[PDB]
Point group: C2
Chain length 202, copies 2
Amino acid sequence: NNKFKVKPLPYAYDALEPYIDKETMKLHHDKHYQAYVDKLNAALEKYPELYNYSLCELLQNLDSLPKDIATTVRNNAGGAYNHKFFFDIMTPEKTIPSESLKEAIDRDFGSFEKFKQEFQKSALDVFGSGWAWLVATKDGKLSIMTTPNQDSPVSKNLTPIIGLDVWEHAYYLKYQNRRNEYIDNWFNVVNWNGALENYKNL
Amino acid sequence: NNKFKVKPLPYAYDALEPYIDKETMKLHHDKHYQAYVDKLNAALEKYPELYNYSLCELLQNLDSLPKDIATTVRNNAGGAYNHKFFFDIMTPEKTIPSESLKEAIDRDFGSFEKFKQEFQKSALDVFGSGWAWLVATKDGKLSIMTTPNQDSPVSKNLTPIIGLDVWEHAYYLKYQNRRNEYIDNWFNVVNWNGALENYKNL
Ligand SMILES: [Co+2]
Ligand SMILES: [Co+2]
């Protein structure tokens, strides 16, 4: 069986309280993430050789996939990849920026504080469903960008370092309309060690 | 003062229970709808003569508004118009299709049941944030279409007859990921008399 799978949450469903509620973690992982994976697998039944592509490979070749599944793969491989990434980039452990990622943030944004301000503003300004990302070019230059729906920076040859889901399902149960509060709180759970590995994998 | 205003909810905040929760009605009207109106008014301070356009006029002329506010007006006039419309198209009273709208539904969809099935499927299939609409051409021909985010059929010279908000904020508190259940329940509160007036105003 080479079908795509949902990665088990890397910590307890209540591990991110009080910043993200357990009920949301259950729904987000067990229902939303699970649905993207199921829908992707269903779409590929017609072209089973595609089960041997990685999620990244699907995302890097959306415009050359068979026409009849291009959109479904974009949405659902996007959803599968972004959510796997998202749960991996959070942690109950305390972490801070370090080594080359820490230096790069200072270099490219001036300071951690300026980076944080810009990231929070970009996340807040996403209109409709989408994501805010810290991304790196292949040479390690950092910037902040957003994507709509389940579109991914991977499709633009940019490497996600950290990323925040600002679909309303990610925050409504606890924060309702107050996305600003969600964004501010989320920084308490960003896994900076994971982000560092993401940066080093360039 | 010719600034755009939030229309007071046309019934009690708990009037749509048990199909839509009071807490959602409060948030949806008092926070989300209110925000679109505030943001629109702010954007027009620079061009106060635009306060004399109707929401429809703004929406019909997005591509000819001053470049610096075109997008903000699209999103926020869209939000203001769609939500005013949405709260107006629901009711605690019992209503059914009648007169010319009833006939037109049968003519254009074959039966009310077929219309309902198609509408529900279109609403379910909206990916990301958006709306499902029953719309009429200027000659009264009916069809179902969806729009993303706060885009509106009005911008395409189509007249909304009924419309369903499928942004997650519209249903997450009560239905969480189960948009299908939200959509099915919503039909209990559709104001068919209001829809009829919408249809007759062609
Ligand atoms: Co999500
Ligand atoms: Co809404």
